């Protein structure tokens, strides 16, 4: 009744705005939108018939951009250790010494041990 | 709760909303059928 | 040794750190880019007392820190990606929480949680 | 002393390291 193009075109400026907001720059945003349109045109994905074309388009976008298990762990940690996880990551994952992490974080040695302590506590406590 | 942030956000994301849509996007949709 | 030459071997590692710290590779790469641009532009310089790798993470941390920071759009990058999505779908794109649930393909409580968390982040460091 | 933490850490996050850097990164650096 209405071509894919006609159904989606009026929403493109808006999902470009969303994509930009989400990824932090317009180039990167457009790449993600592009990928979403290509998957539609290619028929790899189709607009959910239960949803307006606008809602369905954003559902498609999110079907491409898929969250992974590392992303969920990282996001868990962001919640568990919001102010101290950096010091724990610099040492436990990146292999820096505490003395080096103090240079990275621009704080004294005590502040670094404090942070590592907090993060370990919060992690242990699940 | 309220949504002043939305309003503020729309303010500074106005640019992209008003630029013409990249020809490539429309080209891709034409390829549909 | 150019900037490109001193730092190139370390880039896969800063990406690992960036992603682990900020929630996903897109968010992490955003922060890495900002860092490398601060350096190309000479706005910030590698500390001469530190190895290339250590001085690089020192700059990354500095721009990461300051993002919370300066400019609403850029502050959004300090929100966990899944919370940022839920928040932007509703606050910016004007979808209802129910519609955002369809979009994110998750249940409703998860969506309110996610928006809650983004609100938490905004109130703690981003709006303040 | 349960340190499958630094293990699960490597597990969860080490993959990135064996990925190829975005050229945009080099792009930024090439230009002084």
Resolution to 1 decimal place, in Å:
2.1
Q: How was this structure determined?
A: X-ray
Determine, for residues C23 and A74 on separate chains, whether the beta-carbon distance falls below 8 Å: yes
Nearest to C26 by CA among A16, A90, A79, D22: D22
CA distances from C33 to A103, C21, C27 (A): 21, 15, 10
- Residues of chain A in contact with residue C89, where contact means CB-CB under 8 angstroms, are 18, 58
Structural domain that includes position B10: 1-33
Q: Where are the domains of chain A?
A: 1-66, 67-126
Task: State the burial class of residue A109 (Cβ atoms within 10 Å of its Cβ: 0-12, 13-18, 19+).
Answer: exposed
Handedness of CA C115, C120, C121, C127 (dihedral sign): positive
Q: How crowded is residue B9: how many other Cβ atoms within 10 Å of its Cβ? A: 21
Closest CA in chain B for residue C93: B6
Convert chain C into a string of H (helix), E (strand) and C (coil): CCHHHHHHHHHHHHHHHHHHHHCCHHHHHHHHHHHHHHHHCCCCCCCCCCCHHHHHHHHHHHHHHHHHHCCHHHHHHHCCHHHHHHHHHHHHCCCCHHHHHHHHCCCHHHHHHHHHHHHHHHHHHHCC
In the CATH hierarchy, which fold is given to the domain comprising C2-128? Butyryl-CoA Dehydrogenase, subunit A; domain 3 (1.20.140)
8 Å CB contact between C29 and C18: yes
Please report all neighbours of D, defined by 3+ CB atom pairs within 8 A.
A, C
Distance, in Å, from the CA atom of A85 to the CA atom of C22, rounded to the nearest integer, reads: 10
Query: How many CA atoms does the CB half-sphere of A54 hold within 13 Å?
Result: 14
Determine, for residues B6 and C72 on separate chains, whether the beta-carbon distance falls below 8 Å: no
CA distance D13 to chain C (A): 6
Nearest to A57 by CA among A83, A33, A25, A81: A33
Distance, in Å, from the CA atom of D25 to the CA atom of C33, rounded to the nearest integer, reads: 6
Provide the Cα torsion C89, A21, C68, C94; round to 10°.
-30
Q: What's the domain count of chain B?
A: 1
Assigned CATH for A1-66: 1.10.1740.10
Determine, for residues D26 and C29 on separate chains, whether the beta-carbon distance falls below 8 Å: no
Class for the domain spanning A67-126: mainly alpha
8 Å CB contact between A119 and A79: no
Provide the Cα torsion A85, A90, A91, A95; round to 10°.
150
Identify the three-state secondary structure at position A67: coil
Distance, in Å, from the CA atom of D1 to the CA atom of D14, rounded to the nearest integer, reads: 22
8 Å CB contact between A17 and C73: no
């Amino acid at each position: 009744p209405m071509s894919l193009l006609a159904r989606l075109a009026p929403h493109l400026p808006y999902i470009r705005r969303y994509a930009r907001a989400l990824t932090g720059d317009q180039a990167t945003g457009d790449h993600y939108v592009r990928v979403a349109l290509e998957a539609l045109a290619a028929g790899e994905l189709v607009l959910d018939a239960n949803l307006s074309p606008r809602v369905a388009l954003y559902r498609v976008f999110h079907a491409i951009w898929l969250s992974s298990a590392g992303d969920d762990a990282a996001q868990r940690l962001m919640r568990i250790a919001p102010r101290s996880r950096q010091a724990f990551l610099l040492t436990a994952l990146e292999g820096f010494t505490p003395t080096e992490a103090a240079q990275i974080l621009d704080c004294d040695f005590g502040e670094v041990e404090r942070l590592i302590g907090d993060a370990q506590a919060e992690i242990d406590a699940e | 709760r309220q949504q002043a942030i939305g309003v503020k956000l729309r303010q500074m994301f106005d640019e992209v909303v008003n630029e013409p849509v990249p020809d490539e996007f429309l080209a891709i949709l034409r390829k549909a059928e």
